[PDB]
Structure formats: structure tokens, C-alpha cells
Design a protein around this ligand. Structure first.
Ligand SMILES: [Zn+2]
Ligand SMILES: [Zn+2]
Length: 81
């Protein structure tokens, strides 16, 4: 638990920080390409959807896209803000 914290040195520990938003990943971390990212940060760049544990993932420079997006869709256009 957390009771009786005098200072903030314990942090010194390795500590896993997301290489996306630059924030400590509490609970669980997603190890990808020998790095650390959040469960919501390591998502598509267009639709921003979480890649399934099965389907494949396309690699585009820095950001990745989902099969759905990567592939041609009958209905395409600008996404919400
Ligand atoms: Zn993040
Ligand atoms: Zn997508």
C-alpha cells in the first residue's frame, strides 16, 4: 500500500515510461520493438483502434495502421477531431 511516504526517491527504480505520451505506465505495459507503450497509445493512427491479438499490423514509418485502414475501403474520408 501507500501510507507514510516521506519523499519520492523510490521512483528512481527502473520505472516503465511510455515512449509515446511520456508518462509512467501503471498496471500493465505493452512491450513492442523492445520499447514501452500504453494500451491506448499503441493503436492505429487513423481510426485509433486497438490492434487485435491475431490480425496483422502494418508498419508505416513511426505510426502503424490497422488492416482495415491499410486496406482499401468502400467508404473513406476525413476522421473526427
Ligand atoms: Zn502513452
Ligand atoms: Zn485503423
Amino acid at each position: 500500500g501507500s501510507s507514510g511516504s516521506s519523499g519520492l526517491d523510490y521512483q528512481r527504480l527502473y520505472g516503465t515510461r511510455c515512449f509515446s505520451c511520456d508518462q509512467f505506465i501503471e498496471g500493465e505495459v505493452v512491450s513492442a520493438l523492445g520499447k514501452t507503450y500504453h494500451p491506448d497509445c499503441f493503436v492505429c493512427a487513423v481510426c485509433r483502434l486497438p490492434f487485435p491479438p491475431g490480425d496483422r499490423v502494418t508498419f508505416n514509418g513511426k505510426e502503424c495502421m490497422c488492416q482495415k485502414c491499410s486496406l482499401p475501403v468502400s467508404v473513406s474520408g476525413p476522421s473526427s477531431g
